[PDB]
Every structure is written in C-alpha cells, then in structure tokens.
C-alpha cells in the first residue's frame, strides 16, 4: 500500500524537476531575445545619430560648393577677359 | 603673338576638363553616401518594426505564462490531495 | 601692360583657392564614407559573433530539451502505472 | 474509490495541457529567435556586399584623382609659362 504513496511521491518529484527545467529553458530563450533586442536598439540609435547629423553636413556642404562654383565662375571670366585683352594687343601690334 | 592666345586657350580647356572631372568625382562620392544612408534607414526602420511588435508579443506571452502557472498549481494541488487521500485509505486499511 | 600680368596672377590665385577648396570638400566626403564603412563593419562583426554563438546555444538547448522530454515520458508512465494499480485495488475491494 | 481514479485522470489531463502549452510557448520563442537571426544575417550579408564593392570603388577613384592632379599640374605650369612670356614681352616693349 506504500507502493501507491511512493509512486505519487515520484510523480511529484518528476513534475517538479520537469517544471524547473522548463523554466530554465524558457528563461534562457527570453534572455537571448532580450539581448538581441538590445543590440538592435543600439544599432538603430546609431543610425538615427548619423542620419540626423547628415542634414547639418549638407548645410555646410552647400555653403562650400557655392563658394567653389563662384570661384570657377571667376576663373572662367578671368581667362576670358585675358584672352580678349590679348586679342586686342595683338591687333594693336598688327598695326 | 598667337603663342599667348593659344596658351590661354589651353589654360581654358585644362581648367574646364579638370572642373568637369572633379564634378564627376564629387558626384560619385555623394551618391555612395546617399545609398549607404538609405540602407541604414531601411535597417533602422526594420529594427523599429521588430521592437514595436515585441510589446504585443509580451502581452500574449504574459497571458500564456499565467495560464501555464495556474496549470502547474492545479497539478501540484491534485497530486497532493491524491497523496493525502491515499494516506487516509492506507490507515483505514491498517484497521 | 602690367594689366595682363596682374590678371594672370589673379587667375593663378583663383585656381589655387578653388583647388584647395575642392580638395577640402572631397576629403570631407571621403571621411564620411570611411566612418560609415567602419560602423557597418563593426555591426557586421557583432552579427557574426551572435550567429556563431547560436550553434553552441542550440547544442545546449538540445541536451536540455531531451532531458525535458524524458521527464515528461516518466511522468506520463508513472501516472498511468498509478491509475492501473488503482484500478487493480478497486476491484480487489469490489471483492 | 472512483474518487482516486478520477483524481488521477485529472492529474493526467492537467499535466497534458500544461505540457502542450509550454511547448507552444517554447516554440514561439524559438521562432522569434530564428526570425531575428535571419534578419541579422541578411543585414550582415548586405554590409559584406558594400565593403567588398568599396575596394573596386577605390581603384577607380585613384585613377580619376590621379588624372585630376595631372590636370591641375598642367594648369599651373601653363599659367606660369604664360606669366613668364608676358614678363618677356613687357620688357621687349620697355624697349
């Protein structure tokens, strides 16, 4: 009759060990998901930082490219004015 | 005297070709930056999607883990009640 | 006649300033590309680390899930053996 | 005496339902980990693609920047040669 009592005790112990082991498995999987979510968050914030910086970057880039284009315009006008004054002196000498 | 005129023309042509080549280089670098920014944006949005989904995930997970724990509680109480009634029958038989 | 000399000097100065400014622009764009490439490399290596770890993870997970399943099997067999011995005692008492 | 039989049956049913629910939870967590691993893999491969392309990019960039520098050198030499021939003509005229 202690047969049944011992068998119910084994049922209890088996159930307990199975439940604790499944809790361990579950927890480990949850922690993996947590750490991957955190890594993704970190990367996402870094990309946000870069994309927010690029607007100020473009403002500065626009200022500099405008100055660059103005310089090219000046250089072209100057080589043209020079070629013109040379065409003038050449004919003054043709006299 | 056409020496100077031709030399100023070469200056013009060299300047023009250098300016167009530097524009090509500049544009290519800008397009690389654009495409990398776009890739980063896509990844960032995907991470946002995942992290926003995980909250609903956790709501569902909580409901299911609560049901699970309630079931374990029921199983423990039942094996205990069973062992107790067996301890009762065993003594009733000891008579 | 110093007109032309001064004008050629201005051409030289304009060309020099334009070239240095375009070098600055170019360099800044190259450095942006560099830093973004480095960030991508860092992220890529981190993902490599995670994906290489997950194989060992799965080995451990398999060991634990096998133990879990064996425990469930034991619990089922035990509750069945118990119900059977109870069906036996019940009839022994029906006598 | 059917009390114990019914109670063992309830233990069996509770255990079965708890085990199936924990399997569902476990599976859902594993599938989340799978899908996140796959997303990370996709991103990692894309970064690999970009970083492998940038080497050919740099080869082309080097060719173009070398041509650019050669052009600047030509422009400088030409404006210098021009200023020199002008300094020559100016003195020939000073006579």
From Swiss-Prot, chains A, B, C, D:
Testis. Residues 2-95 are annotated as: Required for pH-induced assembly of C-terminal ends into antiparallel tetramers. A motif (Nuclear localization signal) lies at residues 5-8. Changing residue 5 to A: Impairs pH-induced C-terminal tetrameric self-assembly. It is found in: Nucleus; Chromosome; Chromosome, Centromere. Major component of the transverse filaments of synaptonemal complexes, formed between homologous chromosomes during meiotic prophase. Required for normal assembly of the central element of the synaptonemal complexes. Required for normal centromere pairing during meiosis. Required for normal meiotic chromosome synapsis during oocyte and spermatocyte development and for normal male and female fertility. The molecule is in a coiled coil structure that is formed by 4 polypeptide chains. The N-terminal and C-terminal regions exhibit a prominent seven-residues periodicity. Structural component of synaptonemal complexes. Homotetramer that consists of an N-terminal four-helical bundle that bifurcates into two elongated C-terminal dimeric coiled coils. This tetrameric building block potentially self-assembles into a supramolecular zipper-like lattice to mediate meiotic chromosome synapsis. Self-assembly is likely initiated by local proton density at chromosome axis, which is predicted to trigger antiparallel back to back assembly of adjacent C-terminal ends into tetrameric structures that anchor to chromosomal DNA. This is Synaptonemal complex protein 1. It comes from Homo sapiens (Human). The lineage of its organism: Eukaryota, Metazoa, Chordata, Craniata, Vertebrata.
């Amino acid at each position: 009759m202690e047969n049944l009592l011992e068998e119910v005790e084994k049922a209890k112990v088996i159930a307990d060990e199975a439940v604790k082991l499944q809790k361990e498995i579950d927890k480990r999987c949850q922690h993996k998901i947590a750490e991957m979510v955190a890594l993704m968050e970190k990367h996402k914030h870094q990309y946000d930082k870069i994309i927010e910086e690029r607007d100020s970057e473009l403002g500065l880039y626009k200022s500099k490219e405008q100055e660059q284009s103005s310089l090219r315009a000046s250089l072209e006008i100057e080589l043209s004015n020079l070629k013109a004054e040379l065409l003038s002196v050449k004919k003054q000498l043709e006299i």
